[PDB]
Design a protein around this ligand. Structure first.
Ligand SMILES: CO[C@@H](C(=O)NC[C@@H]1CCCN(C(=O)C2CC2)C1)[C@H](O)[C@@H](O)[C@H](O)/C=C/C(C)(C)C
Ligand SMILES: [Mn+2]
Ligand SMILES: [Mn+2]
Length: 281
């Protein structure tokens, strides 16, 4: 279709007061980045709840992807799902972000802001929802087709889901963390795609981004070894075109400079005693 441009935002959606806010709501920055990478058994139990709720919200919003829907409506459905299940939407009020999920159409790499933009036939849309409940976070995203998606765009989406799943399969105690981005990038590059560098996955727990970084490209200089009880996301963004990007005037929305489309998937993972468990169903 035509290159995207910003629509109009709807007003802030309320959250029932009884649902606890993360500490960072309304503040310039979050108190995150230096927390332990291995979680306690108590926190891991809590993170199974938050992950399940985030995965339900993402699935409910995904069911509404269809030509003619607005990205604001996806956000209303995600928001409603989270608050009906007792969870706060972690994006809402993180460094002022104004909505309860990120909706990233077509050439939007990440961090799209739900708004009056109407989806049309052929579009792809990433919906990224995080839930905060029991003092911990759960983060997941997926890219959904709207209507009759072109073969090159269908392939990019299915190969980005494959890359994410291949990477998840490598996770176990003792594995070098660098294998994740080796597996993602070696697979994506077979088809000539380019793996985004400047946005990464991350440890997650009682804080949204806890200071652990997970790269999605090949970077053998990272020495980090995976430990039982570590919790982190794998969330590669994969481009049909070049990596060069621009940020919109809202200071959030990241778009490819060449306007070629891009796809993402994300799960929150637990390193178990023997392998990996997807906490976001
Ligand atoms: C692609 O998006 C991921 C992403 O930017 N990661 C990079 C980390 C972003 C925050 C700062 N970082 C840290 O290491 C700091 C320790 C805190 C890098 C992000 O985690 C998404 O999955 C999440 O759903 C959206 C979060 C908002 C920022 C829109 C609310
Ligand atoms: Mn996310
Ligand atoms: Mn994330």
């Amino acid at each position: 279709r035509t290159a995207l441009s910003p629509g109009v935002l709807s007003p802030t959606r309320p959250v029932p007061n009884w649902i606890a806010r993360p500490e960072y709501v309304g503040k310039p920055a979050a108190q995150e980045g230096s927390e332990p990478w291995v979680q306690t058994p108590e926190v891991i139990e809590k993170m199974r709840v938050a992950g399940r709720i985030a995965a339900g919200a993402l699935a409910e919003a995904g069911k509404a992807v269809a030509p003619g829907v607005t990205t604001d409506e996806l956000d209303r459905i995600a928001h409603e799902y989270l608050v009906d299940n007792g969870a706060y939407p972690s994006t809402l009020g993180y460094k002022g972000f104004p909505k309860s999920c990120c909706t990233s159409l077509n050439e939007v790499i990440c961090h799209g802001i739900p708004d009056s933009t109407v989806i049309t036939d052929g579009d792809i849309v990433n919906i990224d929802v995080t839930a905060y409940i029991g003092g911990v976070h759960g983060d997941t995203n997926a890219t959904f087709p709207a209507g009759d998606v072109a073969d090159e765009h269908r392939l990019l989406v299915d190969r980005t889901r494959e890359a994410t799943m291949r990477a998840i399969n490598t996770v176990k105690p003792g594995r070098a963390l660098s294998v994740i981005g080796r597996v993602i990038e070696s697979y994506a590059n077979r088809f000539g795609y380019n793996v985004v560098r400047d946005f990464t996955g991350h440890g997650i727990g009682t804080t949204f981004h806890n200071g652990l970084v997970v790269l999605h490209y090949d970077q053998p200089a990272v020495e980090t070894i995976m430990q039982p009880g570590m919790t982190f996301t794998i969330e590669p963004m994969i481009n049909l075109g070049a990596l060069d990007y621009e940020i919109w005037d809202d200071g959030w929305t990241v778009v490819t400079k060449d306007r070629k489309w891009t796809a993402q998937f994300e799960h929150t993972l637990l390193v178990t005693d023997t392998g990996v468990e997807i906490l976001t169903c």
